[PDB]
């Protein structure tokens, strides 16, 4: 199985990418 | 619960997307 810390660590990366995928789209649209 | 294989399988997708989100931004910025 997998520990809670590893799952929470991966959750931060997913949230961070969700911000960048929209910042990049907004930056280039400008 | 969830097995280690499924967590590691999802880890590859997150890493792959992290590369594409920057390649796409760099390709369009060029």
Curated annotation (Swiss-Prot), chains A, B:
Domain of life (superkingdom): Bacteria
Effect of gene knockout: Deletion causes substantial alterations in cell envelope structure, and a significant defect in resistance to solvent and shear stresses. Mutants shed exterior layers of the cellular envelope. Deletion mutants show a significant decrease of the UV resistance, especially under desiccation conditions. Deletions mutants show large disruptions in the OM, but the S-layer is unchanged compared to wild-type cells.
Location of this chain's protein in the cell: Cell envelope; Cell outer membrane
Further comment found in the protein's record: D.radiodurans possesses an atypical cell envelope comprising an inner membrane, a large periplasmic space with a thick peptidoglycan (PG) layer, and an outer membrane (OM) covered by a surface layer (S-layer).
Function of the molecule: Plays an important role in the structural organization and integrity of the cell envelope, bridging the outer membrane to the peptidoglyan layer. Is a highly abundant molecule in the D.radiodurans cell envelope but is not a fundamental component of the S-layer. Binds the carotenoid deinoxanthin, a strong protective antioxidant specific of this bacterium, and could be part of the first lane of defense against UV radiation, especially under desiccation. Appears to be a nonselective channel.
Domain comment, as recorded: The structure is characterized by a pore region with a massive beta-barrel organization which is embedded in the outer membrane and shows some protrusions into the S-layer, a stalk region consisting of a trimeric coiled coil, and a collar region at the base of the stalk.
Subunit structure as annotated in this protein's UniProt entry: Homotrimer. Part of a heterooligomeric complex resulting in the main assembly named S-layer deinoxanthin-binding complex (SDBC) which is composed of six different subunits, namely SlpA, DR_2310, DR_0505, DR_A0283, DR_A0282, and DR_A0281.
Protein name: Outer membrane protein SlpA
Span of the entire protein shown here: 215 to 244 of 1167
């Amino acid at each position: 199985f997998v520990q809670r810390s590893d799952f929470d660590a991966l959750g931060g990366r997913v949230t961070t990418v969700e911000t960048r995928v929209e910042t990049v789209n907004n930056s280039l649209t400008g």
